[model samples]
Target: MAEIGTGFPFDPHYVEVLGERMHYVDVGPRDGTPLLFLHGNPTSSYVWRNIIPHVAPTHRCIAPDLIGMGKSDKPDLGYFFDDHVRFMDAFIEALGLEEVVLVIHDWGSALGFHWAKRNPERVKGIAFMEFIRPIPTWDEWPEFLVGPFNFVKDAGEKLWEDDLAKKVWEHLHKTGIPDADKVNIQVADGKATVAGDGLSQEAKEKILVAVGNISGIASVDDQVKTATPATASQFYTVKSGDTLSAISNQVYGNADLYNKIFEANKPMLKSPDKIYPGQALRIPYSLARETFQAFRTTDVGRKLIIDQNVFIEGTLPMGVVRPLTEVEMDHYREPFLNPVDREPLWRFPNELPIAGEPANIVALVEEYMDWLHQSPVPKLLFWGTPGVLIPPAEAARLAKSLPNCKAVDIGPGLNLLQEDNPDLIGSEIARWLSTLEI
Candidate 1:
């Protein structure tokens, strides 16, 4: 075996399965009932490196890298469910194995079950972990899978300070401020300094709002020069008999636009009719459509339409968990060091039979699941606490539904049970194998 520093010390072997050289690790006795371990996306035989050793002494352990993954040949194929099935079937046939005991996880669970269903006479027993079964609707999809969006949102919150000035500059143009390009904007630690010559007072106010209303910006330092400065908006005090409509008619000669005053003093004034006596409100000189539109484009207005707090933080949001050690991350990432080698990692999620869109795969899953219920093969299901794909409730359901099945709870873990509890999984499988009739 090549010492690749991934903790996978097994020697590599390859065989041409359906015109592609499939890489595998074959260890233990040559004539033992094969414990064929299949892997999932973004992982390979490396995932089984630790667990394989525990059972290898008692069984012929064979783990193959799926085509376009790990050391397998990346051929010009669609890499779809059917494609993987064809390759998987060829690999098993090419090895000339019979009476196989299958161990599977993730996408491997699907492929393994499909093969087992077709060759039920040749299969002896089966063990499976995390894989999407009993397909979920779009609404039922796990929120943790949407982690990437939250990651981007959290990243933007942290890093937007660096680009505050550039963003304020862009907003000036977006809000249709005159001489926007000429308005020099400088930002430092959530404060913006605006410096420009010969601007209208309205433009100055717009520029201030454009800079200050941004999420990261705290205050705007106005140094803009206007040829003839207009009177600033007056501050009106509310009396006991005051209403926003009355104030609007007094200030702008219109009573119908009371909502404008209501909007201006939000987070302070609850409602237009909810103002108390002695409350001071800004009476804008103009509440024209353009000014109102520009205000709507501001971050404050955007918040009113869609509250940022409503965005659910991902289950594993950024900075919540301790960072992975470089050595640990390298073990998982070594196979994907090359960008081109990561196509399988990227494509697997997209190929998932979700929301019944991939009709063919959904049909195959349904077919295999139907067969699984009736198939008399002895099965072992090793599930972890709060597992990503299969949670505790789902695990229990499968245990009750699948005939001749045993469900083992392996303590707290996420998707990769092998990484978390390899010894337990390996020993459990070995013990379970003893109970099988193979």
Candidate 2:
């Protein structure tokens, strides 16, 4: 029996399929019908380690790591839908498994469903959660994933080439810049060019510093046109071992005018003593003593500037309700430690069929769904509240469409349902398997 949260303690088993070693875990009686578990992106068969123990005693539990993921061999082939389908077909034939019960999630659900649709006689049943379904439009997709999917669709093959530029745009929004939507920014070889019109002088300077402060940017080409021309304040770059009082005395001949310089850089300067070297500071021009005193006494000059707290506590869409320990997190992170090994993680989202684009994938999903509706194979769907892929509304629709299907609510989870409710999932599968006449 496997212990929950103890990592993948089972000894590994491997078979040569398509000329590469495919790793899997085969436990329980060999004579019983097998339960084949398939996992999704950035995850491995380890995702089902805890769930397998409950059903292993009654049936054979076989969970294989997908090609280019987990302990499986990463072949020199494109990790496309066709590639996965071919490898999965070869894997099943190599193991000589039949009448299999499929447990699937994420992209794994797509593979399992396609196989079950074509080879309906070979599959005994299917238990799925957070699986892929046809997305009609951007509005129908998850709000959080829409931005990333749009970025992927636009970039295509050159996805990571404009990473710095994307970060600059994201930073501009996060900083709450006024008229940010009006500004246009372009980056090439670490140089950012900014162009716009009708921006205030203060706003222009803010934009300059905001673009310049980003780590990857080597320089900024500022072409921003101001609405009105006025005598701009002198710009001073801080040096090592310099204080604001010393800077004021050098520019205005009075250390008391340090507050004026600080006031000029409102919102940017959070504290009087927090100035750092290489930072640009705005220095106000000299004013008569009487004029300066009058300006300081006015209500506008005396007003305090306070930074608003923008952070608010809220529930995250994929947040784990059942906290995972460090050891378990390490197991999940092991496969993704290498940058090159994480290609599947980046490619899977790009391959998603959305709004009729990627015509082949969309067609495949449509055909399989048609077959699934009429197929008499029993299905058990474990859906949760506020899920990423299969929310409650979609769960209800899917339950209505599929024949001989049972819908179970495991409660309070998102995409990583196993991490949040493993015990509930295991027990539910055990109970469902008992009722199966197979």
Candidate 3:
């Protein structure tokens, strides 16, 4: 509900699940991918504070205070390994988390590894340096890991700019500024001010000057001038091979807009068809919006429509995976705000042998196949029933080609086992992973 006021000032949030309260730090944009940080034993989500501030802009860095740990509610249950997993699973399911990138530490590594291995499709990646069985101890692991450890420790000792202002006031008031005591400073309109003040006009003026120096107060010159962004016209050189209609069609996506281009360049253009190779014609921003609107009627738009139609056709038959929800569609669609960024669909069927294309990719696959046959690594070819998109027969055939590969038909269901049977998928995978040497 409030920030800890450390070097990494993070806002904490709490959510209740199954009569127990869970605390977590949810930072960054919701559109971003989840980068879940997990801590273990004596440590809480606070371990990730220093790291989150840097990465939160791009990734939705979520660090949850595990149940009965840190500020999370302590239910009357004994915090066992299974209990932790139950709470963790409940927390993840409640949040509807998918494709999580886990950053784990200590016992959290084992916990995260277990979760990722079970839900291989859902986990995007795992980042961790050390692992812990139930009771872990690492004294001198490496010199590299000490860098972030020292950063978090040292940064915590320093105060913020606002705190700097508060400390100045505390000194003027002649109060015993205790090191442990939180310097309570109130900020308003991007300026820090003291509460229950007893300073005279002369004292306040002097304090304000000091505050301004520490970035807590702004001066008269601090306010930025409201200036308009560059919205001027773009000049294009009239090439020897150029035609008005051709240029209009390429720029505005409509050959009929040639008149607009000609009129705009009237200082040089005598005729709509006449343009010298050396003449620079201006394409005004005023006409940019109109030209963009005209682009929807072009051949590019029709191709875009065809590409989406193909996507719909290809995915429609897949049982478990349906068309994207309206909400989901909008999220992806919003990214291509500019019409020019749209491209034609370029893909071949997965089963097709598109020769000599992406030479490195095919080479990598061949290398991986060779490794699968030679290496001691265990492989699972889990086929979800007799369905399209890697059928059971094909999986079994492929599995037989590799030495350490084990093939098994999971369901009488489709390819998307998670949607069709979530419980079965992870449960079966967990059972299989327990048998692995690692």
Candidate 4:
């Protein structure tokens, strides 16, 4: 196992959720109503190291490192939005939590919101930092991202299968018999346009084909336009009692919007009225904003975005909001330390989901939001920024939409609260919780 940072004073615990040892920090009283903290991508329970202790004495602070994140198991999978929901469902069921309060940040908000909605009777209050709008697509993605997404669309998908292509390139350069210039390489296309000067026709042809085979890219320009379907749509799994009209109303706000969904998933959907449980259906989330500021607030600028673009790529926005700490980097990287840990993170912003299918998640969130519109659950939105992750203005706007939610400016900017402003973040959360009637 890769070493995870045990630098925090608090001791952490783990439980088996689907045979994977799920990790969390549970403090204060288990008798107290659970205050579950869920983290986002490129981060784990470590994000809450400073914030948890503040309210632990009065509230049971339970911060979990989602599967494939932090010190948890990194199972081989796409780590898609639906896969995350599966992990979360299993974790919640395994714990048998009831009557909970949620403290969510980043993708945690997405997972938490869906969870809270699905289990309305069991949740009491919700708090969020950087309450993100939950929908985005390739077209809505940042302009800087076109290159990175294209690289995956063109090179990444095909290149993984061609080991011989790499060897041929090494041999060609090592021998230097075929002048490098004569072999002009276009990596995106996975092809080499070679001139037969020193190398004979058969030799030249072989090299060009090998390069093309290695890259395995063709019609790359076309392939790069669309994001992976998992990222592009919010997947919903059908249940025994599900009806398209009910699902449409739950996810899209109107029961009559079923046709739009039918058209979107025409290949799998045969009729507007029929959908079987266990089948995955892709229903697009409403168009949401991806302002330039989200990218500008981080440090790696475009470089980090490319690394994360496919799914929670923007989750590394800490670069703009606050620089990555040495320990924090170790926590994020440790799970990926295994050479066999080849799971891909092409998913959405929910960190808490571990074991539910997507369709149920969509309905779960739908019910959560419906209850939220009328529920008296006190809502708190926390924010800090010297960088760009969540501008104070954005937090303020979100505050207006939630009937009980209010935005608080922590004043220390976007850096981690654990080091720069830990004391205050805890005090604020404690102070806020004290005031809430729940």
Candidate 5:
């Protein structure tokens, strides 16, 4: 009856604590000291499926899936850090679990420690797996740590959220890693959802409906616009006899912005004299001031011709970047936040090509557009790291409006529709693509 690819590696015990029924392995006995295990996001009690049975007979192994993750009643909006701890607090109390020991991983480390600290007398020894360090007193932190943070918090806060928290989570689901069939032991992409992946077609519809009901982004169109990482590129060419003063004059209409440009592109030249003709140098950030100036004038000779008629999308910002506001963020969701197992958040930023020279960068984007224009395949399935060479938002529009090409955001939530409803996976994407623009 199990349509999921993997089978029960082991059996487990269940619990109904503090009014919340939880799944776990009560290995010891009614009289034995209690030992509890708490799991992280995007994962449920299944993560411990293979290990619990072996350890159950000797000790009381009680593993509970976090509320939003796994087979547990994943009621939305109860995912904040405090809520999790409270649920755990009641979990222990409900089962009358005392004189306890905890096996912790991911979010469990903190909650477990908090429990131990709260009930020091009843606590015994603790075994931890990839436990989270509760605080950073500077002494414990490594010099160059870049691994993702556990989802005790949201994606932007833990990793790269620009500076807002207003439901900018749509981007949290796009994924880049290609599923390896041999390694996954599941079908290609392990995507045959009908066989019984936790996610089902019906479930996905309900989820979409649910998201629409509260999230304000009810349709697939709204989701892509709000979550995909799209950028607007205003390509600048190094015309003949263009001096630093000329750069300022062109940007600010007063030859003053040139100093900032020179500062930004300092490393590109040996000296001021090294500025060459026909050479393209990328401004690390948007030349918005210039673009704005051109927009206002509408004519090249007008005050500050900030007319950026050429808008390219889909690639990362060439220079400084920040978070999108509610109105702006409506176009893209925050990228990648695992619902069950949170710590193993993945990224494929390297999948994109980085820009070096200005002209070459534009050329690279042009090449990609050419590829998309010339492709024989109607539907292109993209999964992997975001390339540096990925074009800007114009690319998104081109891929969408151009006859039959389409692209989509998988977010960190790819597993949401997949692992949650493993069956009928193909149809989900097919429907998603169908809704996209021509």
Candidate 6:
């Protein structure tokens, strides 16, 4: 969006994650357990920007961007929830990884749950922080939560790369927050002692039993075909003296899952061990689409905001485009565009009219309302609204549609029209587009 490097310019490192080139921050040993981080909202791995270092030495930390925002290649091709999972699944399998500890969040759900659940054989345990479960229902539902609605495509998303619209999407969320440096959540590495309930003993036996027969899946083509769990898995083994944690350290990215192995199989060992010369493990498959939960089930849409712990309205982390409820249109701040830098992304005709002639304004707003409901990513800020007459009204309506994500309702339309109140603009805008470094 906005050609990716404008006023709120970004500098992200890119590499091959799965088959596609992906952007990530790597910290730790070349041979350590790999801990992969997936970020949400406009922010990239930068969200964990503050946390990776502390855990890098013991684990390899990697964070990749979603298709639309950040440095990762943004394919013009459509990105569906299920399809995105397959992309990431391929990424893991491509690396020939095993025993992965995934620190998943928001958008991570699309790829996270499927990876973890379907491969229970690959995962030891899980810790959910600021996340909705992949299961269809949760033990408790928060009252503040809003719609399971997703962002629409065609109009809003088709314009995902639209410079003006992208700028609106990014710059709108330039507002500052307290303690921006803190990480959303932290997951520790695996540690195995000679004894304790910490490592699941039963699970280890199961793994040992599991490891006994993984050598020949290819011969059993029908197994993968019948869709039976046994046939579609990969069977690999580490040499003797190799601790599961050590093998996990060797790949999968994080040691959390590695810790599970050591702890679970603690009874078999006389001493603490990491990757030795010989051990057997399975490369697990992510959950099949049939069993996968919908984005709504994870309530990832809402958790993205709450987990950031930012209560200010509109700052909630939403996907590419959010819809407008009935009231949202009536009160939306008439759209206004402000370029932090002197040059706009694409030159706008001086008289391009922010309102775009304000022709059939009601029809236009309603159209957006209907579209947002069917959309996949439900976060969008209108770009074409001309004149600084919005903010208050729209913010109010947005608050109704998505009670979890809202802007401070002082409702100052044109409040910054004169002096270029950069701070005020950033204040209402979310953090992903923190490009208004002015």
Candidate 3 has its poorest 10 consecutive residues by lDDT at 142-151
Flag the better candidate by TM-score, 3 or 5. Answer: 5
lDDT of 1: 0.67
Query: lDDT per residue, candidate 6, 1-438, as tens digits?
Result: 111111212245565654467665666666644666655332445445434544554556666665443455655443444445666776676555676555544445325645664564464222211222122222211111111111111111121222332232232123221111121211111111111122222232222222122221111111011111111122335555565655554543333334434433333332444333333334332111211211122243223222322111222211111222333322221111111111110111111112232233223333433433333322323211111223233434544564122233221112111111223322323231222111
Per-model TM-score versus the true fold:
0.60, 0.61, 0.31, 0.54, 0.32, 0.31
Where does model 5 exceed 4 Å of error? Answer: 1-6, 9-19, 134-438
Residue-wise C-alpha lDDT for candidate 4, range 182-217, written one tens digit per residue: 453334344333333444322332333223323344
Cα-lDDT of candidate 4: 0.55
Residue-level lDDT for 71 in candidate 1: 85
> How high is the CA lDDT of each candidate model?
0.67, 0.69, 0.46, 0.55, 0.36, 0.33
Q: Model 2, 216: alpha-carbon shift in Å? A: 36
Flag regions of model 1 displaced more than 4 Å: 1-6, 134-136, 142-324
* Candidate 3 residue-wise lDDT, 71-154, digit = tens: 677666645455677888888888879777666654465467567655666765554422322111111111111100001111
Q: What shift in Å separates residue 154 of candidate 5 from its native position after superposition? A: 46
Q: How many backbone clashes can be found in candidate 4?
A: 24
| Top TM-score hit | 2
- Which candidate do you rate higher for TM-score, 1 or 2? 2
Q: Who wins the lDDT comparison?
A: 2
Model 3 lDDT, residue 52, Cα: 65
lDDT per residue, candidate 2, 161-244, as tens digits?
A: 366667776667666655666678877776777788888655766666556655555567777876442214556667778798
- Judge candidate 5 against the unseen true structure and give its global Cα lDDT, from 0 to 1: 0.36
Is 1 or 4 the stronger prediction by lDDT? 1
